[PDB]
Amino acid sequence: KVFGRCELAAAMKRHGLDNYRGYSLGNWVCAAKFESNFNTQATNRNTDGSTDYGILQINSRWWCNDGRTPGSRNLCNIPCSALLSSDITASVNCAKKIVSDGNGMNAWVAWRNRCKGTDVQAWIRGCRL
């Protein structure tokens, strides 16, 4: 599924991401835009052999099991394919655990480089929330 901007904002809000660990909704929508272009089916392979999955590009080295990242962890206790669903529940639940692990949203490279320190509220403007 390719989400619309406001559609994703509303889904994220319903799942409790607005102000989660102090990150306003626009931060999450901004991160999803530049991580995956709002596409739940996005995958990208990393040089170390891990793969990033889903709308928030969650990495198999630590967070999910894809059966082909040897010596990796599965901290969200999910198969990585669950992160590609049109239902973002699994991605959101795993993101909550990532953002709580000490480094906040800096765990998302695209957030740090393209959202952090910008007018992130612009990503939810005009949306009915």
Side-chain angles (χ1 to χ4, degrees):
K1 185 177 175 176
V2 180
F3 277 81
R5 177 174 64 89
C6 294
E7 179 186 22
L8 180 60
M12 285 196 152
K13 192 177 212 218
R14 187 169 67 82
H15 283 97
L17 282 181
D18 195 16
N19 295 317
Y20 190 85
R21 290 276 283 200
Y23 289 94
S24 66
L25 198 51
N27 281 287
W28 296 102
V29 175
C30 186
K33 165 71 181 171
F34 295 123
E35 287 293 345
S36 67
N37 207 25
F38 300 142
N39 184 359
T40 66
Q41 294 196 78
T43 59
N44 286 280
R45 194 84 196 259
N46 303 127
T47 77
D48 65 355
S50 64
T51 302
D52 298 333
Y53 294 86
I55 191 166
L56 286 168
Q57 288 293 276
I58 288 173
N59 185 258
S60 64
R61 175 132 337 259
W62 310 98
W63 303 108
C64 59
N65 178 66
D66 63 5
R68 64 162 200 201
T69 313
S72 61
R73 197 66 182 71
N74 178 11
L75 289 167
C76 290
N77 279 120
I78 55 162
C80 297
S81 57
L83 300 176
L84 307 184
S85 176
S86 47
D87 183 339
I88 64 167
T89 300
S91 282
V92 169
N93 286 350
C94 187
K96 287 176 173 172
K97 186 181 287 184
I98 299 171
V99 76
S100 301
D101 72 3
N103 297 290
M105 287 185 75
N106 297 293
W108 287 277
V109 62
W111 180 82
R112 189 185 337 121
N113 290 333
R114 304 181 76 176
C115 304
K116 190 179 188 172
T118 75
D119 179 19
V120 292
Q121 306 82 331
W123 287 101
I124 53 165
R125 270 180 224 142
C127 306
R128 190 158 174 79
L129 299 173

